[PDB]
Structures are given as structure tokens and as C-alpha cells.
Amino acid sequence: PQSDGISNLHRIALRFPKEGGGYDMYRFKVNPENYTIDSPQRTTAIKTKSDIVIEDYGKDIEVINFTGTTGFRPVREADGLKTGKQK
């Protein structure tokens, strides 16, 4: 949920394969400043001498891109006190 006056903000976390099997579960302490998501389509257009032909092949590989800054001031961690540079 976003901050909407009904629930408090919650922030992104990424699960990684642990090299012994199982996982690591990283999380951000300041959320992204820019967030962009692209959804390209594989549709193609060819122009015949007397008509246009529209052809589609379905959904294409999506792209996720976002940009942000790690916070400055120290912030407690679920198993430590880690600063922005350590994060």
C-alpha cells in the first residue's frame, strides 16, 4: 500500500537465491525517486500496394527501471545498525 491515509507506506524487497540453497531477502530503507515500467508489443505493420496489413504476435519482454538514493542518517536493521553506505 501507498500512503493513502488508510495504511502506512511499505517499501520494496528483493529475494535472491542463497548459494547453499534457500534465499537471501534484501530490503530498501528509502524507496525509488523515479520508477518506470515499459510494456512493448511485438506488433508489426507492413504496407501492401493496395492495403495495410496489421499483424500481432503477442506480449513482448517487459522492462522495469527505477532510480533512487540511499538514506544518510543511520537507521536500525532487523539484525544490526547499518548505514546507507553499508547498505
Binding site: 501507498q2 500512503s3 507506506l9 524507496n31 525517486e33 538514493t69 544518510f72
Partner: protein
């Protein structure tokens, strides 16, 4: 009432010192600071998460009636033309007139500008807007 027993600094009880020497006929000594603070905004909430510092900025302005000798060119602080490149880091203090105890120091300065005015039936003035690296104090 008396000097030792007030608990606010009147312009009477403050000396202004520079290059280890007191100044005659100084007027104002305004010292302004900006720590460029601008907290991180964050998509998903309306309010800044923490307020954080982005660039120190320190300016001290001194204004003075132009004395016939020992003006800020004669005391060596100010200068005209290329000769400024020969100058070095000037040093400034604010002191208790009653005990000669430092209130604050400005541990490294350089001039921005050296504004001057002559006017009809008025006293001439120097003005200097120094920039400075840091300010500190002990005792």
C-alpha cells in the same frame, strides 16, 4: 544594569578582531550560514523521510566607516586588481569586550566583494562580504 550582570550581548560588549588586531569604527558583522538541507522525498508518501545536508555555505559581512589610515587595504585584507592572487587565508574573531574571551572564530576566509560609497555630506564606508570555510569556538 551593569556590564558584568546583564545576560544579553549589547553591541557595546563585543569586539571584532581580524588578523590578530582589533578593528576601529566597524559597524555590522553579520554571519550567515546555509547547510543546503533538503530532505529526501519518496514516491509512496507525502512527507520527507529524513532531512539531510547537501552543501555547507558560510558568509560573514563586515561594514566599516572608511578610516584615513588602516583601512582594509592597508591592513592587507582587501585588494584591487590581480594582486588578490597574492593574498592568503584571512582570519576573524568575535570577542567579549569585558574579558577578551572569544565567542566564536571563522578559521578561514576570502573576499567576495569590496563595495565602497562616497556621498555628499556623508561619511565614507568600506563593505566586505567574506566567504569562509568553517566556524568554531572553545571556551
Amino acid at each position: 544594569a551593569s556590564e558584568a550582570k546583564q545576560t544579553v550581548h549589547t553591541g557595546n560588549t563585543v569586539l571584532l578582531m581580524i588578523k590578530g588586531k582589533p578593528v576601529g569604527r566597524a559597524q555590522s558583522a553579520s554571519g550567515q550560514r546555509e547547510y543546503g538541507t533538503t530532505g529526501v522525498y519518496e514516491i509512496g508518501s507525502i512527507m520527507p523521510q529524513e532531512h539531510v545536508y547537501l552543501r555547507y555555505e558560510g558568509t560573514i559581512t563586515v561594514e566599516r566607516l572608511r578610516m584615513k589610515k588602516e583601512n582594509f587595504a592597508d591592513l592587507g585584507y582587501a585588494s584591487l586588481g590581480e594582486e588578490i592572487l597574492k593574498k592568503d587565508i584571512i582570519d576573524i574573531l568575535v570577542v567579549d569586550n569585558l574579558t577578551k574571551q572569544v565567542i566564536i572564530s571563522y578559521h578561514g576566509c576570502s573576499a567576495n566583494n569590496y563595495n565602497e560609497t562616497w556621498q555628499t555630506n556623508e561619511i565614507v564606508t568600506e563593505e566586505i562580504e567574506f566567504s569562509y570555510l568553517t566556524a568554531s569556538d572553545k571556551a
